[PDB]
C-alpha cells in the first residue's frame, strides 16, 4: 500500500512524494489514512482557490507539527491522487499556523528533462512562487497562517534529513 | 487497503462510506473487489444516465441482498472512486429488484458546514430526491427495479445497525 | 492490493488487465510498483500523443523483456488508472525495441455486449488498428521501436500462456 | 452568424447541422436564438441523463412543430455548442409529444471515413439506437413523449425535403 | 451577434446576462469585444482562484465605471462563455476599486425551479456569499478592491434601472 | 463576428490571433467559415496526437497557400475555440506540404507577464519546439509534410507584413 512507499531513493537528494491533491483540481482536500493507506476526504475547502501545484508528503518523516513533511511538486499535467513521483528538492516556503514548511520539489530528471535547470529556489518562476505564497496566505481565510519566506535547496534537504531522523 | 476501512466512527450516526462511482461521471460501474481491495469494472451502463450523487457502501455490513449497505452521498464536487468520506445518514430510498435500500448520507460536519441543516429525509432538496428515485427506476431499463418510497433518518440508522450486526 | 489480482478467471480466454494509463489522457506514463502496488509516475511523455486505448498488463505473467504482458483495451469511456477489467484477447501487435508484443483485448461480454462481435484481429476497426500501430511507431521519437504487424487471437493467447508459464 | 448557415451543400444528401448540445455533456439544454444567433440557455434538464449524441438542427427548415428539423450526430469526440458539421442522413426516430422526428445523421465522408459503412438506419449500432430511443422516452419524465419507431434514410430525406420546402 | 442581445424581457425583474467566465473554470478572464461581439482574452489571472459563479454582464447598460453592469449567476453546471441566461436579480455586492457593484442574479423560473425560493440576498447560501466576497477581495492581490457589503433585490434592480437609463 | 476582427493593433508587432483549436484538446480540427464566421468541423484527425499549443490564424492576411497566416500560441491554460488573443510573434517553423509557415506567437504582455522574456525563437523551450516540429511532421501520417526548420522573430514579422499586404 501507500504506507509502504520509501521516503526516497537517496535522501535528501532523491525522494518520493505521495500525492494527495493534484494541481488545479476541485477544492477537495484528501489525505492518506495512516491506518488503511486509503484516500480520505479530509475537508471541502471553503475558499474559491485551487492548489497551484500537486500537493503531497514524504512517507517516513515527521516534522514538529506531528505531520509528515509536505511537498509541492510542479508537473506539466495534473497527477493522480495516491500516485508517487520521484523528485529532487529545491526550496522551502516557511510559514506559521506552529511551523509548517512546505518544500517545493521538482520532478526527477529520469522522469523528465524539463526541470533540470531548476536547482534552487530562485530558479523557480517568480510568478509560481508568488502564487504559492498567496495560496497559503489565503486558503484558510474562511476556516490562521503566515508566510515568512523562501529558503534554498540546502535548507529544504536539512528539513528532510531532520524529519526523517525524527521519524526513526 | 479499502478492505480495512471501519464501518464508521460512531455507528449509526457517524459512518464512513467507500466511494465506487463519483457524482456525474461517465457510465462506468465500478466495485471494490472483496479479495484484493482493488477497483474492478463491474459493468458499462447501457442507459444514457449518470449517478446524481457519489455512490458507495459501508464496509463491514451486510444486507439481505448479500451485499454491503449502499449509500448515496451528495458533495459539492465529485469524489475520487476508492476514496472514503465520513458522513451522517438522513434517509433511505426503499425499492425492490429483493430489497435494496439505498441510504442517503451527507458529509459529516467536520468536513463541511454546508450540510448541517440537513438532518432528515425531507430536508433534502425535492428535486434531488426525484432525480435519485428516477435514476433507480430507470438505470437498468436496457439491462427490473421498483421504488417504494423514502424513509427517515431513524429507519436509515436501523438499516445500518441491522446490517452491521448481520455482518458480525 | 493490485499485486494480488489474478491473471484471469480462465487463462488465456478470460483475463484481468490492471490499468495504468486511460484512453485519451494527458501524457503521463504510470506504472504499478511491484513493491507497494502503488501507482508510480514512470515518465512524462515528450511527444504530443495520447494512448488510443486503455493500457495495462496481466498480473502474474512475464515476457522476455522481463516485463508483464502489456494489453491495450478499448472501452466506451476512459477507465481509472489502477482499476481492473475482465477481457478476452483478440490480437497482438508485434514489434521490436527486444520483442514487445502488445496484445489487444476487448471487454468481457459480462461487462458489456458492445464488443461481442469482435473475436479476432481483423474484426477490429481498421482505423483503430492504424492509430495503435502509428502510436507505437512514434511515441518515443523524442526519447527506438519498429512495428512488424498484427496477429490473431490464437497467437495472442499463445503469448499469454507462455508468459504465464514463464512467470511460474 | 449561425443564422446564415446553409441547410446543406446538396439537400437532402449533404446537410449542415448547427450543434446546440454536445454528446455526453452536463444537462444544460441550449438553443440558438433566432434573433441574435446567440447561444441561449433554454433549460436545465431535471433528469440525470445526458444526450447520447451531439444534438442540433438544420437551418432553413421548418417542421410542423413550428421548429427546425432536429438531428442527432454521433462523432468520435464531443463537439462544441454552436459549431457546424457536414453530415449525411441515415434514419429518423419518429415520436409524439405533435410529431417530432429526430433524424440521425453521421459525419460526412470528407470529415472522416469512420462512418462510411453507415448508410441506413439498421447499420447503426443497436445499442446506440436503444439508448437514443430510451433517452427520448425518459428525458422529460420530471418536466410527455412517445417513441413510435425508426425509419430509413429515405424517410429521413423526405423529412428534410419537406421541411426545407415548408421553410421557403 | 452578442451585441444584439436585449437587456432583458422585463427590466429590472427579468434580465438576460451575457456569460464571459463560467463557474469554476481555469483562470482565463474573457470579455466580449464591443466592436465584433467576439470573445477576447482579457487577461490571465495571477492568483490560484476561480470564479465561484458564472460571470457576465447585462447588455445595454452602463454603470459609472464606464462598463456594463456585471452579474454573477449560480447554476447547477458551468455555462458556456458567450451564452445567454435569463435571470432575476436578488442582491448586489458593493465594493470599490470607483464603484463596482456586482449583482447576483439567479436563473429564471422558466429555466429551472431550483432557485425559486431565492428571492432576496439573505436567501442565498451564507457560504456562497462569503466565498464571492472573499474572491473579489483577493483575486487581484497579485495584479486594489474593497468589499463594503451586500444589498437587497431592491437595490440591485435600482442599479439595473439606473444603468439602463444611463445607457440610453 | 469573427470575420471583423483586426489583424492586430500594431502589425507585425502586436497582432490578434483567432483561435480554432485549443491546446491539448480532442482531435477535432475546426476552422472559421469565411462566409458566416461560424466554427465548422473541418475534420476528425486520424492520428492519436493533440496540438501542443492553441492554433489559430491572423484575420486579414493571405499567404501563398491561399490561406490566412497560421499561428501557434502557448498559454498557461487552454483557450476557447473562436476566442481572440493579443500576441507578439517570436518565430516561424518553415515546412512544405507548398509553403506553410506556422508562426509561434506568445501572449501580449498586457495579458500576462509570464512570456515577457520570450523575445525570439531560441528563447522558447527546446522541448516545446521539438514537440511542435514533431507534431507537424506526424499529424497527417494517416491522411505529406516536411519540416525545414525555425526562424527568428524578424522572419516571422516579415511573413506577417507580406501576407497582410497580399491580403489588401
PDB file of C-alpha atoms in Angstrom, chain E residues 14-130:
ATOM      1  CA  UNK E  14     -36.430  39.721 -15.981  1.00  0.00           C
ATOM      2  CA  UNK E  15     -32.966  40.239 -17.473  1.00  0.00           C
ATOM      3  CA  UNK E  16     -30.573  38.441 -19.780  1.00  0.00           C
ATOM      4  CA  UNK E  17     -26.943  38.068 -18.755  1.00  0.00           C
ATOM      5  CA  UNK E  18     -24.178  37.507 -21.369  1.00  0.00           C
ATOM      6  CA  UNK E  19     -21.725  34.993 -19.896  1.00  0.00           C
ATOM      7  CA  UNK E  20     -17.940  35.692 -20.145  1.00  0.00           C
ATOM      8  CA  UNK E  21     -16.396  33.387 -17.463  1.00  0.00           C
ATOM      9  CA  UNK E  22     -18.029  30.026 -16.343  1.00  0.00           C
ATOM     10  CA  UNK E  23     -18.199  28.945 -12.775  1.00  0.00           C
ATOM     11  CA  UNK E  24     -15.135  27.023 -11.693  1.00  0.00           C
ATOM     12  CA  UNK E  25     -13.044  27.422 -14.786  1.00  0.00           C
ATOM     13  CA  UNK E  26      -9.371  27.885 -15.455  1.00  0.00           C
ATOM     14  CA  UNK E  27      -8.193  31.366 -14.565  1.00  0.00           C
ATOM     15  CA  UNK E  28      -8.714  32.971 -18.040  1.00  0.00           C
ATOM     16  CA  UNK E  29     -10.606  36.267 -17.957  1.00  0.00           C
ATOM     17  CA  UNK E  30     -12.529  36.796 -21.214  1.00  0.00           C
ATOM     18  CA  UNK E  31     -14.660  39.715 -22.285  1.00  0.00           C
ATOM     19  CA  UNK E  32     -16.967  40.343 -25.175  1.00  0.00           C
ATOM     20  CA  UNK E  33     -15.452  42.877 -27.593  1.00  0.00           C
ATOM     21  CA  UNK E  34     -17.871  45.781 -28.228  1.00  0.00           C
ATOM     22  CA  UNK E  35     -16.631  46.014 -31.741  1.00  0.00           C
ATOM     23  CA  UNK E  36     -17.016  42.420 -33.132  1.00  0.00           C
ATOM     24  CA  UNK E  37     -19.086  40.712 -30.452  1.00  0.00           C
ATOM     25  CA  UNK E  38     -16.222  38.201 -30.260  1.00  0.00           C
ATOM     26  CA  UNK E  39     -14.819  36.637 -27.115  1.00  0.00           C
ATOM     27  CA  UNK E  40     -11.436  38.243 -26.297  1.00  0.00           C
ATOM     28  CA  UNK E  41      -8.868  37.029 -23.815  1.00  0.00           C
ATOM     29  CA  UNK E  42      -8.804  39.981 -21.456  1.00  0.00           C
ATOM     30  CA  UNK E  43      -6.139  38.579 -19.076  1.00  0.00           C
ATOM     31  CA  UNK E  44      -4.691  35.559 -17.407  1.00  0.00           C
ATOM     32  CA  UNK E  45      -5.438  35.834 -13.669  1.00  0.00           C
ATOM     33  CA  UNK E  46      -2.328  35.608 -11.455  1.00  0.00           C
ATOM     34  CA  UNK E  47      -3.904  34.213  -8.305  1.00  0.00           C
ATOM     35  CA  UNK E  48      -4.829  30.484  -7.904  1.00  0.00           C
ATOM     36  CA  UNK E  49      -8.538  31.331  -7.601  1.00  0.00           C
ATOM     37  CA  UNK E  50     -11.605  30.551  -9.708  1.00  0.00           C
ATOM     38  CA  UNK E  51     -14.853  32.468 -10.083  1.00  0.00           C
ATOM     39  CA  UNK E  52     -17.395  30.858  -7.734  1.00  0.00           C
ATOM     40  CA  UNK E  53     -20.328  31.515 -10.097  1.00  0.00           C
ATOM     41  CA  UNK E  54     -20.741  32.277 -13.822  1.00  0.00           C
ATOM     42  CA  UNK E  55     -19.722  35.854 -14.524  1.00  0.00           C
ATOM     43  CA  UNK E  56     -21.242  38.120 -17.154  1.00  0.00           C
ATOM     44  CA  UNK E  57     -22.954  41.445 -17.842  1.00  0.00           C
ATOM     45  CA  UNK E  58     -26.286  42.915 -18.909  1.00  0.00           C
ATOM     46  CA  UNK E  59     -26.082  44.278 -22.439  1.00  0.00           C
ATOM     47  CA  UNK E  60     -27.339  47.852 -22.957  1.00  0.00           C
ATOM     48  CA  UNK E  61     -26.432  49.188 -19.573  1.00  0.00           C
ATOM     49  CA  UNK E  62     -23.703  51.411 -18.398  1.00  0.00           C
ATOM     50  CA  UNK E  63     -22.540  51.985 -14.942  1.00  0.00           C
ATOM     51  CA  UNK E  64     -20.275  54.693 -13.675  1.00  0.00           C
ATOM     52  CA  UNK E  65     -17.103  52.687 -14.120  1.00  0.00           C
ATOM     53  CA  UNK E  66     -17.988  53.169 -17.815  1.00  0.00           C
ATOM     54  CA  UNK E  67     -18.636  49.397 -18.022  1.00  0.00           C
ATOM     55  CA  UNK E  68     -21.859  47.318 -18.400  1.00  0.00           C
ATOM     56  CA  UNK E  69     -23.451  46.107 -15.121  1.00  0.00           C
ATOM     57  CA  UNK E  70     -21.670  42.826 -14.075  1.00  0.00           C
ATOM     58  CA  UNK E  71     -23.743  39.968 -12.692  1.00  0.00           C
ATOM     59  CA  UNK E  72     -22.751  36.662 -11.008  1.00  0.00           C
ATOM     60  CA  UNK E  73     -25.179  33.791 -11.764  1.00  0.00           C
ATOM     61  CA  UNK E  74     -25.146  30.486  -9.848  1.00  0.00           C
ATOM     62  CA  UNK E  75     -26.294  27.455 -11.891  1.00  0.00           C
ATOM     63  CA  UNK E  76     -26.155  23.727 -11.278  1.00  0.00           C
ATOM     64  CA  UNK E  77     -23.472  23.183 -14.015  1.00  0.00           C
ATOM     65  CA  UNK E  78     -20.980  25.615 -15.580  1.00  0.00           C
ATOM     66  CA  UNK E  79     -22.227  27.554 -18.580  1.00  0.00           C
ATOM     67  CA  UNK E  80     -20.562  28.238 -21.949  1.00  0.00           C
ATOM     68  CA  UNK E  81     -18.666  31.589 -22.342  1.00  0.00           C
ATOM     69  CA  UNK E  82     -20.734  33.642 -24.779  1.00  0.00           C
ATOM     70  CA  UNK E  83     -24.069  32.025 -23.865  1.00  0.00           C
ATOM     71  CA  UNK E  84     -27.060  33.940 -22.507  1.00  0.00           C
ATOM     72  CA  UNK E  85     -29.126  33.151 -19.493  1.00  0.00           C
ATOM     73  CA  UNK E  86     -32.473  34.618 -18.390  1.00  0.00           C
ATOM     74  CA  UNK E  87     -32.402  35.518 -14.691  1.00  0.00           C
ATOM     75  CA  UNK E  88     -33.933  37.555 -11.932  1.00  0.00           C
ATOM     76  CA  UNK E  89     -31.784  39.780  -9.569  1.00  0.00           C
ATOM     77  CA  UNK E  90     -31.597  39.133  -5.872  1.00  0.00           C
ATOM     78  CA  UNK E  91     -28.738  41.138  -4.490  1.00  0.00           C
ATOM     79  CA  UNK E  92     -25.668  43.276  -5.022  1.00  0.00           C
ATOM     80  CA  UNK E  93     -22.236  43.127  -3.516  1.00  0.00           C
ATOM     81  CA  UNK E  94     -20.987  46.726  -3.237  1.00  0.00           C
ATOM     82  CA  UNK E  95     -17.252  47.396  -3.367  1.00  0.00           C
ATOM     83  CA  UNK E  96     -14.624  49.891  -4.561  1.00  0.00           C
ATOM     84  CA  UNK E  97     -11.564  49.589  -6.745  1.00  0.00           C
ATOM     85  CA  UNK E  98     -14.595  53.696  -8.149  1.00  0.00           C
ATOM     86  CA  UNK E  99     -17.784  51.813  -7.521  1.00  0.00           C
ATOM     87  CA  UNK E 100     -18.215  48.333  -8.709  1.00  0.00           C
ATOM     88  CA  UNK E 101     -21.404  46.635  -7.791  1.00  0.00           C
ATOM     89  CA  UNK E 102     -21.550  43.080  -8.865  1.00  0.00           C
ATOM     90  CA  UNK E 103     -25.160  41.918  -8.832  1.00  0.00           C
ATOM     91  CA  UNK E 104     -26.119  38.365  -8.085  1.00  0.00           C
ATOM     92  CA  UNK E 105     -28.961  37.017 -10.210  1.00  0.00           C
ATOM     93  CA  UNK E 106     -30.397  33.520 -10.194  1.00  0.00           C
ATOM     94  CA  UNK E 107     -31.738  31.527 -13.118  1.00  0.00           C
ATOM     95  CA  UNK E 108     -35.246  32.466 -14.175  1.00  0.00           C
ATOM     96  CA  UNK E 109     -38.012  30.105 -13.025  1.00  0.00           C
ATOM     97  CA  UNK E 110     -38.781  29.143 -16.575  1.00  0.00           C
ATOM     98  CA  UNK E 111     -35.274  27.647 -16.910  1.00  0.00           C
ATOM     99  CA  UNK E 112     -35.382  25.765 -13.585  1.00  0.00           C
ATOM    100  CA  UNK E 113     -37.446  25.641 -10.382  1.00  0.00           C
ATOM    101  CA  UNK E 114     -34.329  25.125  -8.273  1.00  0.00           C
ATOM    102  CA  UNK E 115     -33.879  28.791  -7.452  1.00  0.00           C
ATOM    103  CA  UNK E 116     -37.476  29.833  -6.899  1.00  0.00           C
ATOM    104  CA  UNK E 117     -37.126  30.158  -3.155  1.00  0.00           C
ATOM    105  CA  UNK E 118     -34.232  32.557  -3.607  1.00  0.00           C
ATOM    106  CA  UNK E 119     -35.862  35.939  -3.672  1.00  0.00           C
ATOM    107  CA  UNK E 120     -33.545  38.180  -1.721  1.00  0.00           C
ATOM    108  CA  UNK E 121     -29.901  38.454  -0.741  1.00  0.00           C
ATOM    109  CA  UNK E 122     -30.232  36.722   2.585  1.00  0.00           C
ATOM    110  CA  UNK E 123     -31.873  33.707   0.896  1.00  0.00           C
ATOM    111  CA  UNK E 124     -28.532  32.874  -0.722  1.00  0.00           C
ATOM    112  CA  UNK E 125     -26.305  30.387   0.997  1.00  0.00           C
ATOM    113  CA  UNK E 126     -24.110  32.197   3.521  1.00  0.00           C
ATOM    114  CA  UNK E 127     -21.108  30.178   2.375  1.00  0.00           C
ATOM    115  CA  UNK E 128     -21.794  31.169  -1.251  1.00  0.00           C
ATOM    116  CA  UNK E 129     -21.893  34.797  -0.151  1.00  0.00           C
ATOM    117  CA  UNK E 130     -18.616  34.614   1.851  1.00  0.00           C
TER     118      UNK E 130
END
